[PDB]
Homo-oligomer: A and B are copies of this chain.
Amino acid sequence: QTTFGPVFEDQPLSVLFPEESTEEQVLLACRARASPPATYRWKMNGTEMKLEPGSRHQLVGGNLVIMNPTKAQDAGVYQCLASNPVGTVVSREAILRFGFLQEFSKEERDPVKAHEGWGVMLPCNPPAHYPGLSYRWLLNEFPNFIPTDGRHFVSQTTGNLYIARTNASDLGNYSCLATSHMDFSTKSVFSKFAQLNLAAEDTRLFAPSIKARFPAETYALVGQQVTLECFAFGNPVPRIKWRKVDGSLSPQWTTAEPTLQIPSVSFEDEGTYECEAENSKGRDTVQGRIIVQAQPEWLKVISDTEADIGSNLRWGCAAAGKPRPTVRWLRNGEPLASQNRVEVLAGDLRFSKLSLEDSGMYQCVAENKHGTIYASAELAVQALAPDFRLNPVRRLIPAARGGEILIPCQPRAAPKAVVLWSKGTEILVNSSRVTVTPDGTLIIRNISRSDEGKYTCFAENFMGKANSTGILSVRDATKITLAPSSADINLGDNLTLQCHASHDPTMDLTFTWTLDDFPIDFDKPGGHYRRTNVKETIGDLTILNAQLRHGGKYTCMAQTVVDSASKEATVLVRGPPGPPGGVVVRDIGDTTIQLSWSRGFDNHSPIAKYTLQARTPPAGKWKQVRTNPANIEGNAETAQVLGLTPWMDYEFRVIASNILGTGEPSGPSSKIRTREAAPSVAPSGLSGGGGAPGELIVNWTPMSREYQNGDGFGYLLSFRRQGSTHWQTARVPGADAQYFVYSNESVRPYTPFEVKIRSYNRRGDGPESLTALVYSA
């Protein structure tokens, strides 16, 4: 930050200057920030310019001023170079150009002879000029301007005049006027008159002939306006149309005018265009292609860098543009080639084994036939003396007797500080114990009591030397003298795992437990394992509450403030298997239903048997049902359930059992209904009597849903007179039916009757009831 190279702020810009302008001087700017302040030099035409006092060119704070300019000694390209002790940089190339407009030739123009009824071409022949001009035509005398109608075409490219069909009105003298529009005023140049002579008039129409043909290839940059001209001769005047061969034209550009204008060409407009001139006599066609190119841009540049001497570096620079650009490298204002270590490859720079002479300003230059761009950076190499303030050696290095120690010495130095280890005043060297790796790490094995003391690391390099000290003392290692034993239990009266340790008599010793690398909690949330506390050298832990979910890889660890030791053990908890799943009802019959289920978790003990329970929705309790086979084995997954009463809904569940006990019941099965069946219970509550004269009423108790056993439930009542041998059967549909009335005028009052009843459904017939004696009205 104290010193930095020249960084540009303002760079020179191109200037267009009128040759006969009233201005007296031209200013080109160049400014750079530097510390110390930079010095500026200027290059013209690739060579250095003699900045002499008084002689035209003057230097004002970096800027270059040229007074009373002329095209013979000033027009050209200039560069500004900024320099200081760190390095030099070069600004972008700046063009200064002059504009002018000459006068028309004094030689008389020959008269043009043509046939009446034929298109005629009249040249203009503009003089030397820059930039482009605007062209007009006049007839006979100024200011009579020929209108730009459908019969006369005036070209803005060549300035010529085209007449589609000549008649007697076109005879006269023509003149071409140039009105080059300067940015401040307009200068006009008037051409010598040319006489147009016309021969005898013919009488014939003709097909169009296109004369002003736009070039096949037109190159344009992104953001320019592109004009295409298409003029043709023809009687009558042909119509002009523009088409895109490889696409669709914009509606705003689809015009019948003989000129096609694109205000801002983008990457889309690239392709082939076709102009067609059509009349009743025929058509003529022109084809030409428009391409689009751009100017280089940046994608990845370089930045300031500080590197340590003896390292390697890689720099990159990426530019994008159409056509693809080329990238070259400059240092301090001169091109870079493959030197001893510098490797330049078409865009990337490789440094190997940096030195103190490879510092300065580096520039990356991208170039193509439409422009150039520059990018700057600064490389600074550094060399330092060894400093231990960042990684000092351990000031205290406690070590356990019988183990090993490793002490690394790594200072901050360049190129690389070499180190040597010593113990007190005795220099340590390779032996069958002490080891010194090339990195400087000191490794001591088989550590004993006589190795305590003060060790020193000495580092040095061709800058200077540094030095540091540590002290080593020897303790006794913490050891385990008893390890816990693996075990297994179901729900017993709890188990005490043991862990005994011996430590140095000077430092505190703490025991800690863990389960499968998850932290343990010997406190008391609900069921809890607990920990005793009598003396330091004991760590027994008792697993209480006689419950589940307390198995894994138990680990006891005895640790001090310095080192630690550990041992491992395993416990298992056995028990009844888990509940089954996947209860599926199949083969739904009147009394038999097949049940299928998936095997549940065995809990590390094979399942011995199964038990099936059933219930009636919605408030029926779970009841064990008769199963085929009577004893279901653990490996079986299907069974039969018997004893079911037909045509009610049922739900089922499964329980598993092993030699260790009985597991949990499974979830309820899906609601299913058994098939229909014939009735099995005869109706009861037979009674009756009274009614209208000649009528007999028989009443019975309505039957519930448990014994209907199917749909279409109803009753059949067989009744007869006392002493008669013929039974009359009546059908009463409906389960809730409870009475029947039989009407007959021949029935005497208080006539005894013998009756019986039976129940039926859609499946079959059930048993009949006992015969009862009733009386009529």
A interface residues, Cβ below 8 angstroms from B: 1, 267, 294, 297-301, 303, 318, 320-322, 324, 389, 395-396, 398, 473, 475, 505-508, 561-562
Contact = CB atoms under 8 A, between A and B. Distances in A.
A318 B299 CA distance: 57
B299 A562 contact: yes
Contacts of A507: 299, 320
B506 A322 contact: yes
A469 to B, nearest CB: 14
A562 B321 CA distance: 14
Given A297-B473, A300-B561, A320-B561, A505 B396 contact: no
A506 B300 contact: no
B300 A396 contact: yes
Contacts of A267: 505
Contacts of A321: 506
B395 A320 contact: no
A294 B389 CA distance: 34
Contacts of A561: 299-300, 318, 320
Contacts of A505: 267, 322
Nearest to A304: B389
Counting chain B CB atoms within 10 Å of each CB, the highest count among A318, A320, A398 belongs to A320
Contacts of A303: 395
A297 B471 CA distance: 12
A301 B508 contact: no
Contacts of A299: 396, 398, 507, 561-562
Closest 10 CB pairs of A and B: A320-B506, A320-B507, A322-B506, A318-B561, A299-B561, A298-B396, A299-B398, A301-B396, A322-B505, A321-B506
A33 to B, nearest CB: 15
Given A301-B395, A301-B396, A562-B299, A294 B324 contact: no
Contacts of A475: 320
Counting chain B CB atoms within 10 Å of each CB, the highest count among A267, A303, A396 belongs to A396
Nearest to A395: B301
A373 to B, nearest CB: 12
A372 to B, nearest CB: 17
Given A299-B398, A322-B506, 6 more contacts: A267-B505, A297-B473, A297-B506, A299-B562, A301-B395, A303-B395
A260 to B, nearest CB: 23
Given A300-B561, A320-B561, A561-B300, A506 B294 contact: yes
Nearest to A504: B320
25 contacts: A1-B389, A267-B505, A294-B506, A297-B473, A297-B506, A298-B396, A299-B396, A299-B398, A299-B507, A299-B561, A299-B562, A300-B396, A300-B561, A301-B395, A301-B396, A303-B395, A318-B561, A320-B475, A320-B506, A320-B507, A320-B561, A321-B506, A322-B505, A322-B506, A324-B508
Contacts of A301: 395-396
A303 B475 CA distance: 23
A569 B267 CA distance: 34
Contacts of A322: 505-506
A561 B298 CA distance: 11
Nearest to A475: B320
A173 to B, nearest CB: 52
Contacts of A389: 1
A201 to B, nearest CB: 55
A298 to B, nearest CB: 6
A553 B479 CA distance: 53
A396 B320 CA distance: 13
Contacts of A298: 396
A396 B506 CA distance: 63
Nearest to A449: B266
A1 to B, nearest CB: 8
A294 B506 CA distance: 8
Nearest to A324: B508
A508 B396 CA distance: 60
A562 to B, nearest CB: 6
A300 B473 CA distance: 13
Contacts of A508: 324
Contacts of A1: 389
Contacts of A300: 396, 561
A241 B324 CA distance: 105
A561 B297 CA distance: 13
A281 B389 CA distance: 76
A375 B562 CA distance: 19
Contacts of A506: 294, 297, 320-322
A322 B297 CA distance: 76
Nearest to A471: B298
A298 B505 CA distance: 15
A300 B562 CA distance: 9
Contacts of A396: 298-301
A297 B398 CA distance: 11
A318 B300 CA distance: 54
Counting chain B CB atoms within 10 Å of each CB, the highest count among A294, A300, A506 belongs to A506
A324 B536 CA distance: 14
Nearest to A303: B395
A291 to B, nearest CB: 11
A508 B318 CA distance: 11
A321 B507 CA distance: 7
A398 B300 CA distance: 9
A562 B299 CA distance: 8
A301 B398 CA distance: 12
A389 B304 CA distance: 11
A401 to B, nearest CB: 12
A448 to B, nearest CB: 14
Contacts of A320: 475, 506-507, 561
Nearest to A318: B561
A335 to B, nearest CB: 24
A139 B574 CA distance: 89
A28 B301 CA distance: 67
